[PDB]
Write a protein that binds this ligand. Sequence first.
Ligand SMILES: OC[C@H]1O[C@@H](O)[C@H](O)[C@@H](O)[C@@H]1O
Length: 301
Amino acid sequence: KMKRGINIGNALESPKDFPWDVKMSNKFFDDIKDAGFDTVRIPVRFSDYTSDDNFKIDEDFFKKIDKYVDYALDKDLIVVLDLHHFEEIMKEPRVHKEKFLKIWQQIANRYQKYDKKLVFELLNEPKENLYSQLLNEYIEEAIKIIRKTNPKRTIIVGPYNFYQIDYLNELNIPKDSNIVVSFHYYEPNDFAFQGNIYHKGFEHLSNITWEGTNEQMDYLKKRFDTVENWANKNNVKIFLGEFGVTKEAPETSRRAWVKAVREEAEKRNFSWAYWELASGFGIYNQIEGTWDRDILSALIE
Ligand SMILES: OC[C@H]1O[C@@H](O)[C@H](O)[C@@H](O)[C@@H]1O
């Protein structure tokens, strides 16, 4: 099902009391669908909308999610609903385990009848103190809750340290046929993030190139070898849930990197979703509804 996807980023994963620079809008799903994408990824920071008791998700905000998911779903888009930027659980996972499992109880109860095309992504980029042996324990506990109301819906999990290839070996594949494994890919980091203010440590880089040299192509291929090999041995399909390049980077390298990564993904039967529609990594002007053909051409011929 999933192949060509895009993230609506820096939108609903914004902090509850500080919105970021992209305003979610139904027109987005029209233009994404018409561009050739079959899949949209929607990061949502539900953790900012809980009664911090039974951890009841604010119904107001929750209705906002009904609006866009239904609209997206009523265009035949696959919608990955993604619990994004749950920051407190990365610092003290043991304190927020229950808050995490309560959150997925509500989500699964509420969209249990929804079309197959609605997919669940449990926890974006586990990092810091939520290390693998806890992450796996919480992942198994969340799937068994979800599986009472959503027994066949697709569920996406990912490894520790920002969904990193290097931590796939520690990620446990659950007892379950309907699970996709996701990694993120932005290597090399200094080229992909250069000049972006939101990427702490990268904001003052400048004019770094990716020309597609043989060593550069070789590295990319070996990194993707590592993931394919893992996925073969574990009989799971892989989803490249985020990849992209900031706008500040050199126009021509940006296109070549994105093409090369997209191509390598498809070459190995990976679904993918480009990091980010309309923000600092974007390829789409939210004010005029126009695309950056130069980058869009790299993603979809
Ligand atoms: O999704 C994680 C992060 O990635 C960056 O692209 C966004 O600009 C940041 O504000 C966000 O914290």
